[PDB]
Amino acid sequence: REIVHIQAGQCGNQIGAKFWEVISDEHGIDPTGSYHGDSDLQLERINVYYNEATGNKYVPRAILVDLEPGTMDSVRSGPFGQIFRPDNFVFGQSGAGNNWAKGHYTEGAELVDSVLDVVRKESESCDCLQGFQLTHSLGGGTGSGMGTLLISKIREEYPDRIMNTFSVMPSPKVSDTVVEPYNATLSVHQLVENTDETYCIDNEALYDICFRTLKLTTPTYGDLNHLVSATMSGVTTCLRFPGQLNADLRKLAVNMVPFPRLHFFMPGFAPLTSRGSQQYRALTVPELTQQMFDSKNMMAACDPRHGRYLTVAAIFRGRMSMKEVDEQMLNVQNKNSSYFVEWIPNNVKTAVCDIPPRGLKMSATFIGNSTAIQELFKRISEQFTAMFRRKAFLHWYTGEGMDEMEFTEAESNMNDLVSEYQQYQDA
């Protein structure tokens, strides 16, 4: 059951590169693509993210997408640059100028069929393809506009496969341009309708974690991305290592999404780890479980106490007593049963994996489908309307063919999304 990974745009390709770096170190694959590890476990589900090449080499099933060549040249120059199949670098030359319209209607339309050709050629060599994985931001142009265009195309060609996104949400604290609330709102309209799971990685939350918790005074994008890559390895641990569950995208979707449009998850990691800073004391299971449910460990800036969990999935990594893990999990649910909806019984699943992530003996990853995520969308909606009530910066978009109507529809669909999440917060 193979997955096809796709990273699009500056942010898309940086977090993607960091993801492949991290899981390639997990599976014992070096930069030349050869396996130099010490367990058969590391290969038991290597097919999910890697193809086999002559000489028993492993090549990530990763398509790299941009309208600019810069970032992808950076990827090639990077530590694991040579592991990617060179054919799978698909780039335009003009860029998207942080403009959803350019990504979705003009500059990205030129490029999209080429991307889809590389997708197709990765799918044809797949015994049973489960679905797709996209990494991108929603506040620029390439990742946002062309990423969602690609998601729409892919759903056309592979309608019965799972569409899965890791989507960085824009925040004024970590902001490149004032038009990010526009690019994100348009994007959310697409994601609501063409993805089965979207991990809402909020740049605001990453910044606060880097600042308040890790005591980094001036965090780069590299620090924010260390956090993102940790979370992504954690979320995908079950696909990549064998457990009692035998994990797949479709069953996760079924178990996490009671209503098709409410598929936006808050991720969390524990223990929070600064880049390079070594952690000497392993955590106790009660500690992992309290932290993993802590708001300060959420990658989306929402307060889980402001809403109710519809569904929860948690993944523990390391040598530890599964009895204690059950005890502590049951413990959290029974001590805070207010914040879990009662009309979805047994709505918290827990898996364990023996192999821990690099640097840690004990770790825990958290995937929450909480209605509190409405806060994030409300935030974007506010920022959106503040400009849109004056039609500010709209000329960047109307010049590319877009009309005011499409903006009003996108805004309206997102406000609807907020209303649904609210609807089940009081059910």
């Binding site: 729409s152 759903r155 056309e156 309608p159």
Partner: protein, 54 residues
């Protein structure tokens, strides 16, 4: 109380003991149901492809 119908054999025995007395659809319809679900699934798929064409 009353032990009845004791049968023995070289593997075991059996008996009753009493204590108190007392005071479908065809293949045609299956294919019809399955094909109706089939049409509903293909119709929703067509609505999707139509939305995408728009």
């Amino acid at each position: 109380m009353e032990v009845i119908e004791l049968n023995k054999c070289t593997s075991g025995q059996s008996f009753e003991v009493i204590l108190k007395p007392p005071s479908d659809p065809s293949l045609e319809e299956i294919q019809k149901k399955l094909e109706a679900a089939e049409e509903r699934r293909k119709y929703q798929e067509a609505e999707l492809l139509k939305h995408l064409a728009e």
